């Protein structure tokens, strides 16, 4: 079905601890495939998935150059932010950026994104129309005027409609055996007596990809969402994910409870 | 600006059984700012050579990281994760439970 590609920038200034640090990660769906850290000895964009290693050298030199220029320009962006808010040069501040594209089953653009945050709060975002900006405050309005006078939205639109989608489709073809294969969850149920009259039933889903999953406990076919404890989906470290759902039930009534899993990889 | 405390999960990569290799993970998520200190502990002592993923963040801008190391669970070995953040006055220790 639908797929996605995203890049995450984090720039962190640190007075007295060296120049600001810059980190970039790239994701196709829930799979990390590229990384960069300005604090590296010889900073370069490095592969993190097998199917991205087939890219020749020129790709890696180009991406590394992009990342070094991004390092410098986001140091300047941190300086500009400190100027806009009349903040002190002794404090640490963070600029974040998410951008990329969502494509549908036909492989063409379905939605674009380019959002920037400062100190954890929204700074400026690119609206759905790929042609206008949403600003968070007055400083963001200064940035928005600078960018709409520079016709930034059109270049963002050109990238998101073009290179984003094409490169994402190439990545999907190169890694079709992992990115387009759905790993169904392996599920089981554990019992834990919490007292003499209650027992905790925990339903486990392990080793599934992608991360989207729905785990519900049912009692006599009735959803127990009000009574279910659900942990946030977590990575296993092998590019798969884990989740569990727990309910406390009266002893001797366990047979009324069944776990229900919804995942793309299950028929 | 903004201060968000980290949520912590400690867990194995595969269902734990004593005697076979596995991976111990500490997943920290939902925190801000980014500076954080994460250690894995075996019977209270810090494990060296623990790896950690690259800094990323969710749709709400809060950061997440995965610290991990190879380990062989036993009946008596106790494992934990110690996390320090600007929002924590003292480090928080979360013990590993094979059932969670």
């Amino acid at each position: 079905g639908s797929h996605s590609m995203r890049y995450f920038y984090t720039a962190m200034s640190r007075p007295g601890r060296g120049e600001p640090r810059f980190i970039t990660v790239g994701y196709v769906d829930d799979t990390l495939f590229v990384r960069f850290d300005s604090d590296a000895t010889s900073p370069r964009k490095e592969p993190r998935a097998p199917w991205i290693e087939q890219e020749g050298p020129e790709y890696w030199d180009r991406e590394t150059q992009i990342s070094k220029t991004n390092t410098q320009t986001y140091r300047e962006n941190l300086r500009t932010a400190l100027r806009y808010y009349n903040q002190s040069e002794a404090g640490s501040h963070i600029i974040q950026r998410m951008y990329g594209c969502d494509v549908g089953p036909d492989g063409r653009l379905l939605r674009g994104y380019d959002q920037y945050a400062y100190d954890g709060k929204d700074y400026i975002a690119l609206n759905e129309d790929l042609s206008s900006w949403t600003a968070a405050d007055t400083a963001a309005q200064i940035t928005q005027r600078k960018w709409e006078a520079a016709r930034v939205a059109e270049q963002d639109r050109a990238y998101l409609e073009g290179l984003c989608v094409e490169s994402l489709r190439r990545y999907l073809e190169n890694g079709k055996e992992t990115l387009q294969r759905a790993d169904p969850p392996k599920t089981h149920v554990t019992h834990h007596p919490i007292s003499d009259h209650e027992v905790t039933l925990r339903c486990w889903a392990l080793g599934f990809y992608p991360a989207e999953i729905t785990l519900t406990w049912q009692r006599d076919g009735e959803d127990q969402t009000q009574d279910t404890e659900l942990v946030e989906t977590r990575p296993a470290g092998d590019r798969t994910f884990q989740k569990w759902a727990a309910v406390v039930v009266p002893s001797g009534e366990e047979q009324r409870y069944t776990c229900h899993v919804q995942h793309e990889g299950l028929p | 600006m903004i201060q968000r405390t980290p949520k912590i999960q400690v867990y194995s990569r595969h269902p734990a059984e004593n005697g076979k290799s596995n991976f111990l993970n500490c997943y920290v998520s939902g925190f801000h700012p980014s500076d954080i200190e994460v250690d894995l502990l075996k019977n209270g002592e810090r494990i060296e050579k623990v790896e950690h993923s690259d800094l990323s963040f969710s749709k709400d801008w809060s950061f997440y990281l995965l610290y991990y190391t190879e380990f062989t669970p036993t009946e008596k070995d106790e494992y934990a994760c110690r996390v320090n953040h600007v929002t924590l006055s003292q480090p928080k220790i979360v013990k590993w439970d094979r059932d969670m």
């Epitope: 808010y85 945050a117 100190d119 954890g120 709060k121 929204d122 968070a136 405050d137 659900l230 942990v231 946030e232 989906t233 | 600006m1 903004i2 201060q3 968000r4 405390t5 949520k7 998520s29 939902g30 801000h32 969710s58 749709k59 709400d60 801008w61 809060s62 929002t87």
Partner: antibody, heavy 120, light 108 residues
Amino acid sequence: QVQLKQSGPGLVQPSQSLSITCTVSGFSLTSYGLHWVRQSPGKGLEWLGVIWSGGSTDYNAAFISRLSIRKDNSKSQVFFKMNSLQANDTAIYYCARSLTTATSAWFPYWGQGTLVTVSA
Amino acid sequence: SIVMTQTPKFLLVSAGDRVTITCKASQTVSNDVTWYQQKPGQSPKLLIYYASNRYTGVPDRFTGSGYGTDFTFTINTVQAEDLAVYFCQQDYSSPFTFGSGTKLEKKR
């Protein structure tokens, strides 16, 4: 248009639990966090907790021993549950949402409120 | 836990004069301060956020200012519809504490 509609009993016995359902329209719980605040004469406005888009939660430390916030994304419902209620807890309870998907804890959007009285 | 101290508990006002409400944080709180207005029987209504940014549809009379610890909420020309309770709230750190509130009442 963002809409938070609350439902729940307004009278609970002074030891039992309080359950409030906030039903959401105009946005998806998979994208926004939902917070719970209360207002009482003794303590004024109190932020109680939040459930984020991914299902993780944050609780007011003074309430963490008896508070739970759960949700059903597909049904757009958030379930606030608080245990061991006393006379302190009689108050108006609100669900609330921030402006954006960030972790901001200020609210342009409030539920209509649920007055709960704790009495036997 | 950061404590927000809302200076005036009540203000006797006549239509036409400036009101100034103060909110002091126990610890530094950056610009993460919000101002609400509440009328009897209703939920709080957002007025100011990020210390000085006006929410959509909030009239020009209302104004927020401040950074760090001392914050100020001003109504430049009070109108009869402004008789209500006003609250500050910090967003810096949990539990995102609210001020005690300032009740505006009619002077006689």
